């Protein structure tokens, strides 16, 4: 397995950021990439074994270290906005040999020149209508998170205190509703009887990742240390 730490991170310009990667595959090679909408997956630095650190396509602005067989760290000593991206770790076969590599879950990293820009989301439940179309049903309940920044969020459905996956339609990726604000939607298509069952409890969870204890929160204003927000509702009459 390939683990990445942390999974999300928002930092200020000029600060030092370190992303760690742990593997349990006992693989000699380890890699550090960065994915950007537009460009592809670019190699930053890679390793041949403990004590080895070779440079990839885009090494400028980053350092690395392979202290052991299981660890390969990426280091940003002077964080710049330009380093905002999703970082992927991997281990396994050779360079360019993707069929041999094992990727990690990716790390969302946003470099802001002011943490005061971080804001939690606004989650809400809705209900569409067939009258708005000449089609059929489309979707029953609708969840929408907006007004958050950066885009470090996860949306899930839980009916009756149990997470569901049937009939869930979430946006592939949060869209920017303004210069410093994101949006994200989802829909849950359930049976009219279930929805009309006043005993059923629906819930839409949204995981927003912001500042932590390690983050230098400029005091004064309330520290955006929010977490899981929920939009809950019950069944309505027939």
């Amino acid at each position: 397995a390939v683990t990445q730490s942390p999974r999300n991170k928002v930092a200020v310009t000029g600060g030092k950021v370190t992303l760690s990667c742990q593997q349990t595959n006992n693989h000699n090679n380890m890699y550090w990439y960065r994915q950007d909408t537009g460009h592809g997956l670019r190699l930053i630095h890679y390793s041949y074994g403990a004590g080895s650190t070779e440079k990839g396509d885009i090494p400028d602005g980053y350092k690395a270290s392979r202290p052991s067989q299981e660890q390969f760290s990426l280091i940003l000593e002077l964080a710049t906005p330009s380093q905002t991206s999703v970082y992927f770790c991997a281990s396994g076969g050779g360079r360019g040999s993707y069929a041999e590599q094992f990727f990690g879950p990716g790390t969302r990293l946003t470099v802001l020149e002011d943490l005061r820009q971080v804001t939690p989301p606004k989650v809400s439940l809705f209900e569409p209508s067939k009258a708005e179309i000449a089609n059929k049903q489309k979707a029953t309940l609708v969840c929408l998170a907006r007004g958050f920044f950066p885009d470090h969020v996860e949306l899930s459905w839980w009916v009756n205190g149990k997470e569901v996956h049937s009939g869930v339609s979430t946006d592939p990726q949060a869209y920017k509703e303004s210069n410093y604000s994101y949006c994200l939607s989802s829909r849950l298509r359930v049976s009219a009887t279930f929805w009309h069952n006043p005993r059923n409890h629906f819930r839409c969870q949204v995981q927003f990742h912001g500042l932590s204890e390690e983050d230098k929160w400029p005091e004064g204003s309330p520290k955006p240390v929010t977490q899981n927000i929920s939009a809950e509702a019950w069944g309505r009459a027939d």
Binding site: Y48, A50, S52, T53, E54, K55, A64, P67
Partner: protein, 239 residues
């Protein structure tokens, strides 16, 4: 002097190396092999000795393969209680595989390699830690000088060299992730009238071979801890 001093146009120029100086820095960081009063437990090739040295800290190894310049060196220390100290590597460290049906091996899990760094234990110890001095010159200008401790009579050059470059790295940024603040450099080990030096910079190109570099230590060159004057000569970058 015994070994002719490094002619200016003989030293590697760091700027000719374009391949991450981190591979060199790592060899001189706080980590290194060290064993006290130990005997070899096997041997891969006639020119090496496998020892049971466990990395109590990082846990990066369980066995250490010490390679020598010649079979004589191996046999000499084979089954002899010694002390081991040196800059090890992992990348191209191939050895044994599984004690076999023809191949004299063993080694179960975690392993590394190194060259030389062997000295007898008994009668080589000192009650008090000896303190050698290092004279570092940055363009002739002797701006820095510090001491290197040890407690062996016949200490290997590799041990002193490591101990010397180590300090330089942390205090003078001798080796950095990408490059170095110095164009050239060499460490001069002077005993009596005899003296030898080592090129501190990597070979030209875009890749650093740690295995080939450390190989300069396979001679297991020793030096008298009382008859040693260390001098480092570095050339700064003209920014």
């Amino acid at each position: 002097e015994s070994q002719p001093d490094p002619k200016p146009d003989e030293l590697h120029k760091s700027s000719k190396f374009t391949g991450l100086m981190e591979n060199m820095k790592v060899l001189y960081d706080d980590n290194h092999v060290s064993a006290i009063n130990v005997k070899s437990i096997d041997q891969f090739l006639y020119f090496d000795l496998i020892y049971s040295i466990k990395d109590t800290k990082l846990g990066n190894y369980d066995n250490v393969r010490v390679e020598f310049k010649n079979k004589d060196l191996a046999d000499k220390y084979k089954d002899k209680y010694v002390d081991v100290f040196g800059a090890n590597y992992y990348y191209q460290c191939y050895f044994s595989k599984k004690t076999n049906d023809i191949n004299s091996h063993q080694t179960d899990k975690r392993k590394t390699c190194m060259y030389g760094g062997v000295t007898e234990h008994n009668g080589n110890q000192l009650d008090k830690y000896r303190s050698i001095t290092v004279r570092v010159f940055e363009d002739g200008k002797n701006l820095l000088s510090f001491d290197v401790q040890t407690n062996k009579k016949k200490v290997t050059a590799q041990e002193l060299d490591y101990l010397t470059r180590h300090y330089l790295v942390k205090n003078k940024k001798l080796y950095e992730f990408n490059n170095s603040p110095y164009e050239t450099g060499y460490i001069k080990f002077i005993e009596n009238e005899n003296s030898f030096w080592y090129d501190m910079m990597p070979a030209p190109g875009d890749k650093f071979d740690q295995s080939k570099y450390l190989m300069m230590y396979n001679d297991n060159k020793m030096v008298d801890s009382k008859d040693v004057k260390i001098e480092v000569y570095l050339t700064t970058k003209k920014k």
